């Protein structure tokens, strides 16, 4: 059960391969490839949206 992922390659111009050998998920290597991103939680917690090109205070 080998897993083939993608290496960090760079941008203006390849895969790896991993097999887990231990019975415990804690033994696994790092999740260095998780790129989820949601600023909205902290940057726009306002209940009434807020459009940019609009008069902020009506």
């Amino acid at each position: 059960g080998a897993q083939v992922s993608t290496q960090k390659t760079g941008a203006h111009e390849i895969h790896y391969t991993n097999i887990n050998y231990y019975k415990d998920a804690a033994s696994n290597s790092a999740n260095r490839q998780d790129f989820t991103q949601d600023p909205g939680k902290f940057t726009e917690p306002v209940k009434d949206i807020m459009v940019k090109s609009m008069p902020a205070l009506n």
């Binding site: 960090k8 760079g10 941008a11 203006h12 111009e13 790092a30 260095r32 490839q33």
Partner: protein
């Protein structure tokens, strides 16, 4: 554990080894490539470019742009020798400092044909014919035009085309010669002689210069990397 058995070689550090190794900076995002003119892929692309050969590397001339200027003039005699140097591109002073020679010096063996181009820098009113020749080893070096002429030669006639090419074919018993200078690997002699003479009208200089360039032909290749003997150091620069 998977039964394993270590072999000789384990833990050594060979400078030309080629293994994978962990990156100290995981997920580092490099800066996008650009596209710079002039990319190079093989040192041979450089050795295939003409460089000016210091044929006139005598004594005091070696620190003068003069090292690069072959003297040629009108003479009262026939078939005089203009210059001569051996085909020992890696080790001879005439050739070893050119782009080609510098690259040869990072290697131990070389093989190929070489192009020598001569550019006449007289004046438009000067004329003359020269005989450029290459003579494989075995007999001596030619001491007269009749001797040189019996070998590989081209008869350059000065006119609109300032330049002319003597192409030196690869004639060896080996496949590769050492850049290092061995009598076994002797490569012959390159010489030039007046075929006629530099005739010029009155009010025009009779003394002219000729520049000579070198580069590899398309069959050229070097082998065996080594450090150049050309760069020393006593201790870390600061």
């Amino acid at each position: 554990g998977l039964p394993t058995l270590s072999t000789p070689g384990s833990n050594q550090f060979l400078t030309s080894d080629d293994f994978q190794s962990p990156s100290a900076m995981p997920q580092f995002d490099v800066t996008p490539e650009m596209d710079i003119p002039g990319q190079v892929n093989n040192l041979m692309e450089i050795a295939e470019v003409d460089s000016v050969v210091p044929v006139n590397n005598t004594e005091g001339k070696v620190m003068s742009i003069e090292a690069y200027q072959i003297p040629v003039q009108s003479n009262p005699t026939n078939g005089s020798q203009v210059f001569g140097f051996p085909l020992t591109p890696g080790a001879n002073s005439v050739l070893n400092r050119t782009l080609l020679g510098e690259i040869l010096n990072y290697y131990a063996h070389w093989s190929g044909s070489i192009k020598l181009t001569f550019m006449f820098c007289g004046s438009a009113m000067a004329t003359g014919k020269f005989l450029l020749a290459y003579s494989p080893p075995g007999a001596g070096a030619p001491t007269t035009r009749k001797e040189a002429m019996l070998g590989t030669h081209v008869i350059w006639d000065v006119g609109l085309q300032s330049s002319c090419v003597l192409c030196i074919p690869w004639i060896s018993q080996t496949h590769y010669r050492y850049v290092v200078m061995d009598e076994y690997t002797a490569g012959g002699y390159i010489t030039c002689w007046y075929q006629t003479n530099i005739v010029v009208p009155a009010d025009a200089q009779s003394d002219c210069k000729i520049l000579c360039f070198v580069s590899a032909c398309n069959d050229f290749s070097v082998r065996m990397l080594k450090d150049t003997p050309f760069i020393k150091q006593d201790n870390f620069f600061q």
